[PDB]
Design a protein around this nucleic acid. Structure first.
Ligand SMILES: [Mg+2]
Ligand SMILES: [Mg+2]
Ligand SMILES: [Mg+2]
Ligand SMILES: [Mg+2]
Ligand SMILES: [Mg+2]
Ligand SMILES: [Mg+2]
Ligand SMILES: [Mg+2]
Ligand SMILES: [Zn+2]
Lengths: 135, 52, 58, 84, 50, 103, 122, 134
RNA sequence: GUGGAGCCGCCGCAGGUGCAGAUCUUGGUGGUAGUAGCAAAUAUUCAAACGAGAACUUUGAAGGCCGAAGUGGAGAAGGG
RNA sequence: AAGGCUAAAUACCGGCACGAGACCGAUAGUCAACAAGUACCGUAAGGGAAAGUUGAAAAGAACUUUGAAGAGAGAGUUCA
RNA sequence: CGCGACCUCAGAUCAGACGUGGCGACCCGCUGAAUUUAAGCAUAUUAGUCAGCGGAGGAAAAGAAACUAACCAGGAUUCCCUCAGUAACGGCGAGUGAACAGGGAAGAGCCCAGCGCCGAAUCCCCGCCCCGCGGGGCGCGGGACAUGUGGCGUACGGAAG
RNA sequence: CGACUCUUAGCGGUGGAUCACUCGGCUCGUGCGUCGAUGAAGAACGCAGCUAGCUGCGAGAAUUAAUGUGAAUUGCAGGACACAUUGAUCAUCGACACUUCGAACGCACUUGCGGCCCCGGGUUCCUCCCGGGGCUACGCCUGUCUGAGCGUCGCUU
């Protein structure tokens, strides 16, 4: 997990925020692993990834990537979706199956903390004052 | 800008006021005392034929 | 003359030679503080300055 | 000695003008700029001052090329010339 | 300084060319309201700061 | 802070609520907009009917509402099978199909 | 003596540059006439020759870039200033052909089950 | 009453489009009526004024049956100068006083190849207005 | 009387609705007041010239000071 | 379930164009009606003003006179 | 010892492409306080908001069920009116607080891996041409990719022979 | 008598209040919803006959071509009026052009220092000789060429 990057463990707040050393970083490690793979290769588009070993210190993932500008990708209209410019850098927005597990979305009674759009798109709609015109 | 600009009136009062607004436009005193010079005109609910 | 500020003395020395058909002995430049480069073109003693100035107007 | 006589020694400069924004904020020892952070690739801007964006956002300079892009938009970016 | 670099003295030439009064033929123009240069810098009072 | 006989109240205005306000001044401006999204769709289609396909008879759930009849999503396969029409030809006839509905 | 660009297009390349160097010669000797006492008439002539000297340079560059665009017409790999500009994001859209590609699973889905037109009274 | 919802009716934006006008719009807005003799021969109402029209002034301090040609048309100050109406200065030099072309009546047009084509188009577009009355 | 282009009464409506104070905000002006003051490092004087005009400018003479770690002669930084 | 795409209804105090208002009227309204993110301030981050109005038209007071000039006294322009 | 293959890797100003930075009102991923309230204050509240950081687009995100339901059952998402200041949370204090039916806006659905089947039936690049405008190809011959699996018919509503 | 002081009023000054105006806001709304290696945003410098600023521009520098328009620009000069040439001006803007820094890109940032390739003249030139032109950043994809390996192995000697 992550250690809170704060000098000498002094967080300077109320005692519920003395959390230096039990903090857990709510996005997954595989989503971290895809994120620094598609960051190095910003010309590449990232599809998803999987597990290929873990030691005690390191964890190894094979990340699969897609060149949007090669003609075996820019033809074949069942592959043309990724070369459409809304899919630029999918893991920095949290769109892949490794990364979309961390947003907590899905249908159900267990997942309607995000029942409009995303997590904070629910929060903005729950916490807006919807005063009408004739009220 | 979220001042209550707009007002509701329930519709039987809208229709109450619109029957009271038409019935006073037939009395010659109320329509002339609002200023409309209606001296020389004939019969007060003026009806010209549908060719107009 | 007053010379464009990107011009070195080899560029000046051919530019007075080809426009005015005269030999140039040496050039000494200067950036005068209005911002334009001033050049002191000395002629070879074969030529003269007081009549080459006459055929260029002054 | 704290005040006006210690203003006598103010003789050598900290900051000179930056190559990217022209500011007198290119620090000479640290070699970074105060306003833009010059040797860094990204621009130094902060939400905790909405004026310091407003001093330097788009629309405050010449816009040498977005005048033409915003003008070619309303005809669909033609390439071939006019008829006579 | 007398030891100045080229980007200093082409900055100082730019500040020196623009310290000049309005020509007298602009006060006669139609619909102006500038009547003296208000951005005038004097070398003792207001200093450039490098 | 309280007084004589009145209500004890929990207004939820302890949060920065002036930023998330939604004022409906464009609401006549959008009601005349999505009329135009219907009219310029209805003449856009065909003599095909407006307001989309035909919907089923569907009874509501949840004891309060189970005594009434609602329009559903799609007719479905079981009901399409008996009527004789194909399950993928049905939506170019103008008949919506909901395959996840059970009879 | 006016210079019109519709006149200049019927000239050859060797004639424009001889006539370009000419206007640079009068423009240099009017700058001598400005730095001396000068003449009222001469100073005015200074603007109408330097806009005249841009008409000659425009016809040189327009009869070069469109002389050279007819060289590369119908070639793969034509240069960058000859490719269309249009905006940065326009060059990365697919094209009017490859956006029409439909997979063969979805071609037979179209020809077997097309969209019909219909109406509902009788 | 204005019905087109894309053209202004406010005071402040119609003035701002008037005094910041481009100089080709500004010849259009500096138009003057033709004389009653001459608007029957050409069946056109008014014309944008140019440099050598014979013209007389119909309202102001200098007015009344004084046909005399224009000599200079300031567009920037919305002013024509006419060769006869002048003013002596305190110096004794005579200057042209300037008057607005709406207060002024053309009595002889200056025809060129273009002032045929402007009149013919402004006159042809009036018979279609007559042809609508069926 | 000035001034030079708009404005008011009545019936309803709507507020950014009326000041003497907040060591109130901004702007303006008084009394104090022709007053305090124009006093660190010894010092000026005579004639003349230019000039509408000279205790102060220039020049000539006299008297003096800095007195070679300078009130002298050259630079770095800074100023532009 | 642990693979993937997908339009519409929705959000928009940045942008390019527009329309309007029971709004504000140069100490107001944007900080900014004007050479305003301007002069100017701070080593720098940053701070950040003042400032609208001749007349219908410059017709912006020729000429005389006093004075070295500013400044007057006459004359004149303009409905003023 | 030489040679050939292949695998793992290098280099190059290789041929042809791509990514960078800005703007950031709205949108997506994380990170994240304290003032304040509780008449004190620590859990709580402020607030998963301010600031910080990264990614986009004309919209984004979501989205065709590992659902809601518990009865005569509904049937992707998003938005509205309700549900509701309600069930619930909480020094059970201050405070906080969703959803499902129902009414509407809009409505649209699909594809792969796998299991088998078809002699890789498939794609990229180069070269000259059918023949063309404003350039993209189905047609021709070579170099690669590819059996460690390209393409076709297929997807849970079943499918194939 | 005079002066001084005080209270009212006229007249003059100081001051810029009030009133009347308003090419500016502000609010709401509609429609579109477009940057950048093909060098953006921004910065610096420069450019006018007389021009310091704002504005507009980029050594083709207060604009060039084209189309539309059809006799001006104007503070003063100056010049072509030609328009059954081609035509002033202004708008539009689709052709061309667009210095320096900047993601900034040969390397550095001190206008500091190169490296190949080609061109015009000088040693008719290799082995560092003037000017000009082209090229040279990092990441990374597909392909090509070159080749590392007591990696796996084949055929060999
Ligand atoms: Mg209510
Ligand atoms: Mg308005
Ligand atoms: Mg975009
Ligand atoms: Mg004031
Ligand atoms: Mg032109
Ligand atoms: Mg070179
Ligand atoms: Mg670098
Ligand atoms: Zn900087």
């Amino acid at each position: 997990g992550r250690k809170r990057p704060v000098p000498k463990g002094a967080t300077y707040g109320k005692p519920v925020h003395h959390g230096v050393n039990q903090l857990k970083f709510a996005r997954s490690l595989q989503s971290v692993a895809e994120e620094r793979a598609g960051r190095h290769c910003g010309a590449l588009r990232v599809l998803n990834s999987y597990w290929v070993g873990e030691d005690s210190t390191y964890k190894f993932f094979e990340v699969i990537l897609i060149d949007p500008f090669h003609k075996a990708i820019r033809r074949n209209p069942d592959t043309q979706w990724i070369t459409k410019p809304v899919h630029k850098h999918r893991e920095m927005r949290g769109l892949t199956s490794a990364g979309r597990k961390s947003r907590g979305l899905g249908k159900g009674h267990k997942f309607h903390h995000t029942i409009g759009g995303s997590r904070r798109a629910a929060w903005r709609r729950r916490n807006t004052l919807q005063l009408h015109r004739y009220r | 800008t979220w001042r209550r600009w707009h007002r509701r009136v329930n519709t039987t009062q809208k229709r109450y006021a619109i029957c009271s607004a038409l019935a006073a436009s037939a009395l010659p005193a109320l329509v002339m005392s609002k200023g409309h010079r209606i001296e020389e005109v004939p019969e007060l609910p003026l009806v010209v034929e549908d060719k107009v | 003359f007053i010379v464009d500020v990107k011009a070195n003395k080899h560029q000046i020395k051919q530019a007075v030679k080809k426009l005015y058909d005269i030999d140039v002995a040496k050039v000494n430049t200067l950036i005068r503080p209005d911002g334009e480069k001033k050049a002191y073109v000395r002629l070879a003693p074969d030529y003269d300055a007081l009549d080459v100035a006459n055929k260029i107007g002054i | 000695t704290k005040g006006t006589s210690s203003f006598g020694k103010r003789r050598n400069k900290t900051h000179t003008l930056c190559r990217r924004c022209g500011s007198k904020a290119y620090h000479l020892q640290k070699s970074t700029c105060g306003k833009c952070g010059y040797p860094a690739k990204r621009k130094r801007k902060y939400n905790w001052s909405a004026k310091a964006k407003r001093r330097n956002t788009t629309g405050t300079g010449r816009m040498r090329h977005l005048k033409i892009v915003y003008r070619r938009f309303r005809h669909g970016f033609r390439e071939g010339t006019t008829p006579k | 300084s007398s030891h100045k670099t080229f980007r200093i003295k082409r900055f100082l030439a730019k500040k020196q060319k623009q310290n000049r009064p309005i020509p007298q033929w602009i006060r006669m123009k139609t619909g102006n309201k500038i009547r003296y240069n208000s951005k005038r810098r004097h070398w003792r009072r207001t200093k450039l700061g490098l | 802070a309280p007084s004589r006989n009145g209500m004890v109240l929990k207004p939820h205005f302890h949060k920065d609520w002036q930023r998330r306000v939604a004022t409906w001044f464009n609401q006549p401006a959008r009601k005349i907009r999505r009329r135009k999204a219907r009219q310029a769709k209805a003449r856009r289609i065909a003599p095909r009917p407006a307001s989309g396909p035909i919907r089923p008879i569907v009874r509501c759930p949840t004891v309060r509402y189970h005594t009434k009849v609602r329009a559903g999503r799609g007719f479905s396969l079981e009901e399409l099978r008996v009527a004789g029409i194909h399950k993928k030809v049905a939506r170019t006839i103008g008949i919506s199909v909901d395959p996840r509905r059970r009879n | 003596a006016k210079i019109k660009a519709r006149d200049l297009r019927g000239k050859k390349k060797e004639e424009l540059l001889k006539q370009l160097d000419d206007l640079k010669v009068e423009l240099s000797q009017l700058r001598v006439a400005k730095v001396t006492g000068g003449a009222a008439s001469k100073l005015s002539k200074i603007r109408v020759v330097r806009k005249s000297i841009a008409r000659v340079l425009t016809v040189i560059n327009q009869t070069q870039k469109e002389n050279l665009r007819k060289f590369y017409k119908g070639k793969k790999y034509k240069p960058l200033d000859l490719r269309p500009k249009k905006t940065r994001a326009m060059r990365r859209r697919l094209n009017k052909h490859e956006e029409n590609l439909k997979t063969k699973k979805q071609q037979r889905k179209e020809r077997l089950y097309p969209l019909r037109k219909y109406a509902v009274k009788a | 009453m204005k019905f087109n919802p894309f053209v202004t009716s406010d005071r402040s934006k119609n003035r701002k489009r008037h005094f910041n006008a481009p100089s080709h719009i500004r010849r259009k807005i500096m138009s003057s009526p033709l004389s009653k003799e001459l608007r029957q021969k050409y069946n056109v109402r008014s014309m944008p004024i140019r440099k050598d029209d014979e013209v007389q002034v119909v309202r102001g301090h200098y007015k009344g049956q004084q046909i005399g040609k224009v000599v200079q048309v300031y567009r920037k100050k919305y002013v024509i100068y006419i060769e006869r109406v002048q003013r002596e200065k305190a110096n004794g030099t005579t200057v042209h006083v300037g008057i607005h072309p709406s207060k002024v009546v053309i009595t002889r047009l200056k025809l060129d190849k273009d002032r045929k084509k402007i009149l013919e188009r402004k006159a042809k577009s009036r018979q279609v207005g007559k042809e609508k009355g069926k």
